[PDB]
């Protein structure tokens, strides 16, 4: 800590308080998060990708672990709130979706999962880049149904489900499944995608928190769920939201989806 001057608190991430800070020697401006774990965290220092927020240093000292990250100037939640009157332009949505899928394809190839993707953890800069941060009231809005049903050994698919939920929210300007308890989160999912059964998700009825007494709701039409997203966007979103984690599209396969045939990298309008 003595090598860093706090400039301001910018957040309380899940694992602790985050400060913007300046390195007293390097002059570098960084984000400092103050929080088996040593060895895992050290392995993250190697997982470098242009769409992953760089972890610069891990400082263990005195019952405190500090993590020093590259600093970005805005998060997607704030940008979404800033762009709510007009909406984020489709080409920028597609570019951010495509970049995030590149980040996930990289992490998943190294068998690292995020598990807690949410707009506040997706960070943007003036050049049109978006990056995944801060790998794992707690928000449930992005949690995959297998996690909600008590699967202990869930997979990379959970991150595809969270990113699908964020893709829908960029497009409609409303959270897709804004649950305020675990059951309300699961029932919001069922009310929109249909209560899952053995046909669409083999094994579902033997999940730890599955109850036969769950209400059975009909699936709704996607054209009702994300207007005015085009047929290619809806097709991709449907594959990122399949109930069975084994049928859910991978990040690698999503990158090849026809929705990205015309992807580009627009500059966002950022007011810092």
Ligand X SMILES: COc1ccc(CNc2nc(N(CCO)CCO)nc3c2ncn3C(C)C)cc1
231-240 vs 157-172: helix crossing angle, rounded to 10: 140
C-alpha span between 172 and 199 (Å, rounded): 30
Reference 233, options 98, 102, 81, 118; nearest CA is 98
Which tokens sit at 234?
């809806």
| 3-class DSSP assignment, residue 244 | coil
C-alpha span between 14 and 161 (Å, rounded): 20
The CA-to-CA distance between both ends of the chain, in Å, stands at 27
Question: Is 127 annotated in some ligand binding site?
Answer: no
Smallest gap from residue 133 Cβ to ligand X (A): 4
Question: Is 32 annotated in some ligand binding site?
Answer: no
Cβ proximity to ligand X, 18 vs 170, nearer residue: 18
Question: Is 18 annotated in some ligand binding site?
Answer: yes
Active site members: 116
Residues that bind ligand X (rule: CB under 6 A) add up to a total of 19
Report the run of H or E that residue 99 belongs to, with start and end: helix 90-109
Cβ proximity to ligand X, 124 vs 189, nearer residue: 124
Question: Is 16 annotated in some ligand binding site?
Answer: yes
Among 123, 132, 140, 237, indicate the residue that binds ligand X (CB under 6 A).
Answer: 123
State yes or no: residue 134 binds ligand X (CB under 6 A). Answer: yes
C-alpha span between 93 and 99 (Å, rounded): 10
C-alpha span between 50 and 37 (Å, rounded): 24
Residue closest to ligand X when measured from CB atoms: 11
State yes or no: residue 195 binds ligand X (CB under 6 A). Answer: no
Residue ranges in 60-89 that form contacts with ligand X under rule CB under 6 A = 69, 71-75
State yes or no: residue 33 binds ligand X (CB under 6 A). Answer: yes
Binding site for Mg(2+), residues?
121, 134
Interacting residues toward ligand X by CB under 6 A: 10-11, 13, 18, 20, 31, 33, 53, 69, 71-75, 120-121, 123, 133-134
């Amino acid at each position: 800590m003595e090598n860093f001057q706090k400039v301001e608190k910018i957040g309380e991430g899940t694992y602790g308080v985050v400060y913007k800070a300046r390195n007293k020697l390097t002059g570098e401006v960084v984000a400092l998060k103050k929080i088996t774990a040593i060895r895992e965290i050290s392995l993250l220092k190697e997982l470098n990708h242009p769409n992953i927020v760089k972890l610069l240093d891990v400082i263990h000292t005195e019952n405190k672990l500090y993590l020093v990250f590259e600093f970005l100037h805005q998060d997607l939640k704030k940008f979404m709130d800033a762009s709510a009157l007009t909406g984020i332009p489709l080409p920028l949505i597609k570019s951010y979706l495509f970049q995030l899928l590149q980040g996930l394809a990289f992490c998943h190839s190294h068998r690292v999962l995020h598990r807690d993707l949410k707009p506040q953890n997706l960070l943007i800069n003036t050049e049109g880049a978006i990056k995944l941060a801060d790998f794992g009231v707690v928000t449930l809005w992005y949690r995959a149904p297998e996690i909600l049903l008590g699967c202990k050994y869930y997979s990379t698919a959970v991150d595809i489900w969270s990113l699908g939920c964020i893709f829908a929210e960029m497009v409609t300007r409303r959270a897709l499944f804004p649950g305020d308890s675990e059951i309300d989160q699961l029932f919001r999912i069922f009310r929109t995608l249909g209560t899952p059964d053995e046909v669409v998700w083999p094994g579902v009825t033997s999940m730890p928190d599955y109850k036969p007494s769950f209400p059975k709701w009909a699936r709704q039409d996607f054209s009702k769920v994300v207007p005015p997203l085009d047929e290619d966007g809806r097709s991709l979103l449907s594959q990122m939201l399949h109930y069975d984690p084994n049928k859910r599209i991978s990040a690698k396969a999503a990158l090849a989806h026809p929705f990205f045939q015309d992807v580009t990298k627009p500059v966002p309008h950022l007011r810092l």
